[PDB]
Design an enzyme around this catalytic site. Structure first.
Site: not given
Ligand code: CA
Lengths: 4, 240
Positions: B45, B61, B64, B69, B93, B186, B188-189
């Site tokens: 979904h 975060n 920030q 990342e 799902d 938020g 989800s998954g």
């Protein structure tokens, strides 16, 4: 049911 | 995650943020689990909309620079062929995203360990949900990754009348339902990490909560049961  | 605590930076290195392009920026929409250096497991979904998506690994975060990342585009989306957007309660799902580049592993970026096929957890098994979802029903996303302790609720109890009834299927894992802690929009998954034989494995892909609210007593958060899809997952990765 609520998709989150 | 409602009633969570802030996760330590290196606790859950397979958690990713799935984001969509929105104007001149990117918005977090869902979590996921890195399962190969170029594949992410998330909820079907989350990828229903015809959006441009990217994956961020090594994220802590959302608001920030963490100095850890890596940002990578989604090259291909494979949703489970039985998924039906009009019926989240039917299950299926789950979706796999092939990343445009392979990410680099380190203490902030690791593959999620998946359970063996068919594994079912005993009632009340220790698990944590993680994510950047809303911190209250109808609230706002978290800035920093959150975790909450959500023990499982077995199929018999979860599908009983007081809980989810026949809305829950044996292809799902229920966890929590205490009225204080839960997944929320938020999340989800993303993963449900469960400690088994000394090692955390990703037993669930966050799927849904009650239309009544996120943290509702006897409406545990519901997840796709990863161990029901191991062959499917292996099949997709091998053919893609
Ligand atoms: Ca960041």
């Amino acid at each position: 049911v609520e998709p989150i | 995650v409602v009633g969570g605590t802030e996760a330590q930076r290196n606790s859950w290195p397979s958690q990713i943020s799935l984001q969509y392009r929105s104007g001149s920026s990117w918005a977090h929409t869902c979590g996921g689990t890195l399962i190969r250096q170029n594949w992410v497991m998330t909820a079907a979904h989350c990828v229903d909309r015809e959006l441009t998506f990217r994956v961020v690994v090594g994220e802590h975060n959302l608001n920030q620079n963490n100095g850890t990342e890596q940002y990578v585009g989604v090259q291909k989306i494979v949703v489970h062929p039985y998924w039906n957007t009009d019926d989240v309660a039917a299950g299926y799902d789950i979706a796999l995203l092939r990343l445009a580049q392979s990410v680099t592993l380190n203490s902030y970026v690791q593959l999620g360990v998946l359970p063996r096929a068919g594994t079912i957890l005993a009632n009340n098994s220790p698990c944590y949900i993680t994510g950047w979802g809303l911190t209250r029903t109808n609230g706002q996303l978290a800035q920093t990754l959150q975790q909450a302790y959500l023990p499982t609720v077995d199929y018999a109890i979860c599908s009983s009348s007081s809980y989810w009834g026949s809305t829950v299927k044996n292809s799902m894992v229920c966890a929590g339902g205490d009225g204080v802690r839960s997944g929320c929009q938020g999340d989800s998954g993303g993963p449900l990490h469960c400690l088994v034989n000394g090692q955390y494995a990703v037993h669930g892909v966050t799927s849904f909560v009650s239309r009544l609210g996120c943290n509702v007593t006897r409406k545990p958060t519901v997840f796709t049961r990863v161990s029901a899809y191991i062959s499917w997952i292996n099949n997709v990765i091998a053919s893609n």
